[PDB]
């Protein structure tokens, strides 16, 4: 159980989010995170609603059965090639983008996809990769923040701009190790 509450005491002094961004679909039992993220970013920057995770994934995996498609994840090179195919000059940048860079990209209506990886605790403990969407940035209580969307969710999330540690829903932690910029 969990309820929504008010957050009266925060002081949002500045907020800058990607024009036209809207959560339209949610990721459940599939590995299509990158497709969810790219779909939301391209829907925002192209100002449309025609992109969706399933159709992106199908384009990336044209020969996979419908039954096996949910289990297909995305390689970095597919994220780049797919973006290019939609008229976006995608570039990878290692690490967390600065607040100032996010602010500039967002005002320029350029989308950023987060590439995240969990932290292994043993050689037999395989780290897991995930993909998310940057939505923009804000100054809240005098602190610089980035705003992002985990496909698992129906709401947005807030990240300290000076941290790579993403505290996702269901108490899962991933590190933001780089970004695909250009959507």
């Amino acid at each position: 159980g969990h309820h929504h509450h008010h957050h009266e005491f925060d002081q949002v002094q500045y907020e800058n989010t990607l024009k036209n961004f809207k959560i339209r679909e949610q990721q459940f039992d599939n590995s299509w995170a990158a497709g969810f993220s790219m779909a939301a970013l391209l829907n925002a920057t192209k100002n449309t609603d025609t992109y969706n995770a399933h159709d992106i994934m199908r384009t990336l995996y044209p020969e996979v059965s419908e039954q096996d498609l949910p289990n297909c994840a995305t390689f970095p090179n597919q994220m780049i090639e797919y973006g290019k195919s939609q008229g976006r000059d995608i570039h990878y940048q290692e690490g967390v983008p600065s607040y100032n860079q996010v602010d500039q990209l967002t005002k320029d209506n350029v989308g950023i996809m987060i590439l995240a990886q969990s932290v292994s605790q043993n050689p037999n403990d395989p780290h897991l990769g995930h993909a998310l969407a940057v939505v923009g940035n804000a100054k809240i209580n005098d602190q610089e923040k980035l705003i992002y969307w985990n496909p698992w969710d129906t709401e947005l999330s807030i990240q300290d701009a000076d941290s790579s540690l993403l505290h996702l829903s269901f108490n899962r932690d991933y590190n933001w190790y780089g970004s695909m910029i250009g959507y």
Partner: protein
């Protein structure tokens, strides 16, 4: 009025090679479990060298009450099971080499 899909999960591990905490941890997941929205159900058992629907344990995570495993016939899919309470566990999938992990899916006890 509608059928579910049932995935049989026969975990193979040498009870002999585990700490007691590890054993308690794995045992949390043995049982029959369902998700009503997906109409999916899982039947998790400790199998053996001779079972079908065999799955290999990759890691037992006692700190988070969790196990990671893969099917003998597809190493590119990693399953992650987390324990919530005696009536609920969470199953997530991910790929071995790619980027993208599923939402944890709630399965509640049945049978």
């Amino acid at each position: 009025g509608s059928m579910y899909q049932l995935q049989f999960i026969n975990l193979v591990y040498d009870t002999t090679k585990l700490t007691h905490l590890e054993q308690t941890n794995i045992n949390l997941f043995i049982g029959n479990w369902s998700n009503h929205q997906l109409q999916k159900s899982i039947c998790i058992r400790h199998g053996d060298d001779t079972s079908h629907n065999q799955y290999h344990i990759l890691f037992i995570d006692t700190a988070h009450q969790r196990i990671k495993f893969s099917s003998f016939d597809n190493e590119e899919i990693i399953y992650i099971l987390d324990y919530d309470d005696t009536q609920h566990i969470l199953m997530q999938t991910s790929s071995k080499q790619g980027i993208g992990t599923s939402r944890p899916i709630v399965y509640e006890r049945l049978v």
